[PDB]
């Protein structure tokens, strides 16, 4: 009854935890019970993960948010107070949620793909992201599928990454879900299979969608740290 992304062992139970509503969707997130209890194993059961949630160790996106099924989606920096645990969780190359450990100056921010820019009411420019941070007043040159950098103390955009040909992009969606390498090709079609294409070890080619891909930095310099093997 589980998805593939959670890295959930089959010998666990019968009812799978539906995440509650929140920032991200159901299909692109993992809740805190499947995060803490059975992935990096700070708990043994739902009772004691509710106990540490009542103790309020979790500090995801700089706020506490004491809830069992809180849908932590892409790169919400899970922060735990004891042993200064800073966790940025991204996608691995085979579809799961690889939770990388980072440090404090990297967990002081996150980034987010812009979805739409609106002239909503009363002359106010407007920007949303995958956690829905409706932050005030970016520059006019925010296209769709660019990348804002959230402040995580206040909410303001601090840095901006422009989407164009020659940018380091992350793909979350479809049969390319979780690949990095961002350059063999660029092809913007007019309604589907439109993208920037991603290399491999032998620099192979790949096809995805615009909304299923979003930028993380430059060719060699992302200010996100990434795990390795």
């Amino acid at each position: 009854a589980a998805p593939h992304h959670w890295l959930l062992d089959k010998l666990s139970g019968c009812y799978a935890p539906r995440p509650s509503a929140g920032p991200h969707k159901l299909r692109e997130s993992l809740p805190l019970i499947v995060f803490l209890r059975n992935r990096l194993k700070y708990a043994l059961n739902g009772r004691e993960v509710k106990a540490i949630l009542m103790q309020r160790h979790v500090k995801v996106d700089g706020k506490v948010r004491t809830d069992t099924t809180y849908p932590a989606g892409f790169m919400d920096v899970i922060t735990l107070d004891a042993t200064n645990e800073n966790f940025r969780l991204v996608y691995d190359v085979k579809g799961r949620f690889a939770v990388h450990r980072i440090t404090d100056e990297e967990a002081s921010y996150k980034l987010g793909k812009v979805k739409k820019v609106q002239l909503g009411k009363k002359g106010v420019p407007y920007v949303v992201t995958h956690d829905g941070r409706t932050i005030r007043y970016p520059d006019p040159n925010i296209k769709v599928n660019d990348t804002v950098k959230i402040d995580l103390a206040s909410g303001k955009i601090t840095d901006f990454i422009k989407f164009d040909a020659g940018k380091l992009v992350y793909v979350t969606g479809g049969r390319n879900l979780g690949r990095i390498g961002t350059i063999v090709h660029k092809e913007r079609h007019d309604g589907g299979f439109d993208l920037v294409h991603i290399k491999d070890s032998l620099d192979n080619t790949f096809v995805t969608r615009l909304n299923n891909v979003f930028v993380i930095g430059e060719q060699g310099k992302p200010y996100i740290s990434l795990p390795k093997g």
């Binding site: 593939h4 085979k94 579809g95 969606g173 479809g174 049969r175 390319n176 879900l177 589907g192 299979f193 096809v207 995805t208």
Partner: peptide, 12 residues
Amino acid sequence: FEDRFDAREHKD
């Protein structure tokens, strides 16, 4: 046509 995420083909 178009892609569709297949864990049965990237599953061990």
